[PDB]
Amino acid sequence: GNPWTEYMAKYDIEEVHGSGIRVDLGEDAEVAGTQYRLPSGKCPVFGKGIIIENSNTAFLTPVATGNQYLKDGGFAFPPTEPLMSPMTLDEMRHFYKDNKYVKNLDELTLCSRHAGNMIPDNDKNSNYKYPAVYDDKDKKCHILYIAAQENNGTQQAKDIGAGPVASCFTTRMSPPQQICLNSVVNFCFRPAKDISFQNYAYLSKNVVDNWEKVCPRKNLQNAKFGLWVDGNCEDIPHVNEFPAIDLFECNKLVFELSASDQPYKSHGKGYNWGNYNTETQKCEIFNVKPTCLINNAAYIATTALSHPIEVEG
């Protein structure tokens, strides 16, 4: 007897996303006998990036390679021959022009599939696929070489997402081609929604083709998450109030408290939702799936997955 069922489906994080948000390590994959953790969420995480502590290096900088003094880098794939990352949207469309399955794929899905094309060469039967970040401003897809997302002070490295030490990769696309790093690969960090990440989307290998329709992106203006009980949309019974100067800060707080696979698997369970009161500047965070919306002109409904700025009616 709930008329909101279909509308609210995209806010059922456990179902539509199915993995952690702050830290997504929801699946395991073997590469040459060794198990690794890797992101597996089905929805893009809008505005998510990685902040490297004691550094000005943007995390989309390619991972450091070589042995040079002051060697420094980020998380993205280093140069390869041919160059696989970063790749603009038009370069991806031209690169896959002979693959008729990539037609009509939107920017984010194409980027996730591009990142999933590289197989750690030591195991052709491996399901290991690297995650990616799409920059909607420059229209660039960055394949992440490091799948780890948090390290604030070996198996314990594997437990945070340390990927396989891989220098050569085989493409899943046919005809197969082997692509190796031009050099050998050799810090503490945390995920966050920083204002400088506003145009970024963090993408696991599992981002679904139809994310635009099933996943949350825009925050809901004049709306408040509730629970459907006996013909009425009741308030969430238990919330944690936090001060938030605007919607962005509230979305940032929801993201920090959201489902996390950091040491093991949340499967999407967590403080993933927030009702932001724009009059009292309060962020009301909760960990129960909402099943209806309340009409309240002072509220904006947000989720950890949602873009931290964009709103809709």
Tell me the technique behind this structure.
X-ray
Within 10 angstroms of residue 185's Cβ, the number of other Cβ atoms is 17
Structure tokens at 131: 């995650």
**Smallest Cα–Cα separation from 73: which of 181, 169, 157, 207?**
181
Q: Tell me the C-alpha distance between 144 and 281, whole Å.
A: 36
Domain boundaries, the chain: 3-11+218-258+271-313, 12-217
Q: Give residues with Cβ within 8 angstroms of 97, minimum separation 6.
A: none
Q: Amino acid identity of 1? A: G
| Side chain identity at residue 191, one-letter code | P
Residue 7 phi/psi, 5-degree rounding, is -65, -40
Do 282 and 276 meet the contact criterion of CB atoms below 8 Å apart? yes
Q: What is the 3-state secondary structure (H, E, C) of the chain?
A: CCCCHHHHHHHCHHHHCCCCCCECCCEEEEECCEEEEECCCCCCEECCEEEECCCCCCCCCECCECCCCCCCCCCECCCECCCCCCEEHHHHHHHCCCCCCCCCCCHHHHHHHHHCCEEECCCCCCCCCCCEEEECCCCEEEEECCCCCCECCCHHHHCCCCCCCCCEEEECCCCCCEEEECCCECCCEEEECCHHHCCEEEECCCCCCCHHHHCCCCEEEEEEEEEEECCEEEECCCCEEEECCCHHHHHHHHHHHCCECCCCCCCCCCCCEEEEECCCCEEEEECCCCCEEEEEEEEEEEECCCCCCCEEC
State the Cα–Cα distance between residues 296 and 280, nearest whole angstrom: 13
Choose among 178, 146, 173, 174: nearest CA to 160: 146
Torsion angles phi and psi, residue 235, rounded to 5: -65, 155
Q: Are strands 118-120 and 168-171 parallel, antiparallel or unpaired?
A: antiparallel
Tokens of 143: 């394949």
- Point out which residues pair with 228 in neighbouring strands: 233
